[PDB]
Amino acid sequence: RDSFGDWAEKFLKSKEADGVSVSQLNSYKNYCRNHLSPLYMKSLSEILPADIQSIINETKLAKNTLKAIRNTASQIFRLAIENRAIDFNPADYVRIPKIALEHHHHHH
Numbered sequence: 001r002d003s004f005g006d007w008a009e010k011f012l013k014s015k016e017a018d019g020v021s022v023s024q025l026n027s028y029k030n031y032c033r034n035h036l037s038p039l040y041m042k043s044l045s046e047i048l049p050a051d052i053q054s055i056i057n058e059t060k061l062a063k064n065t066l067k068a069i070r071n072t073a074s075q076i077f078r079l080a081i082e083n084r085a086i087d088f089n090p091a092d093y094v095r096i097p098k099i100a101l102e103h104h105h106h107h108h
Contacts, residue, residue, distance in 0.1 A: 002043055002044045003040075003043050004036070011028065012032070044077075052070070052073060053094050055069070077092075
């Protein structure tokens with residue numbers, strides 16, 4: 001009975017009350033709204049570890065951004081674990097792909 005959107009909104013409000021910068025707070029909101037959008041409408045029990053990994057596959061941005069998305073999710077799941085809504089953190093099972101060749105591709 002615990003939707004990711006529920007806990008995400010609480011996490012957002014939590015950090016807003018914690019005293020983070022508005023731009024920073026809006027960053028969290030953007031992560032859960034845009035990237036974790038499919039998850040936001042799902043329940044914690046309906047969220048798959050490989051499903052989050054799929055979001056990382058579809059999100060094609062810089063390393064820092066990819067990890068930031070996952071880190072944000074991890075913190076949200078941790079909050080859920082605090083209330084014991086979910087029993088584990090699938091986001092911490094998500095690994096950030098390091099597809100990196102020393103030789104340049106098309107973009108020099």
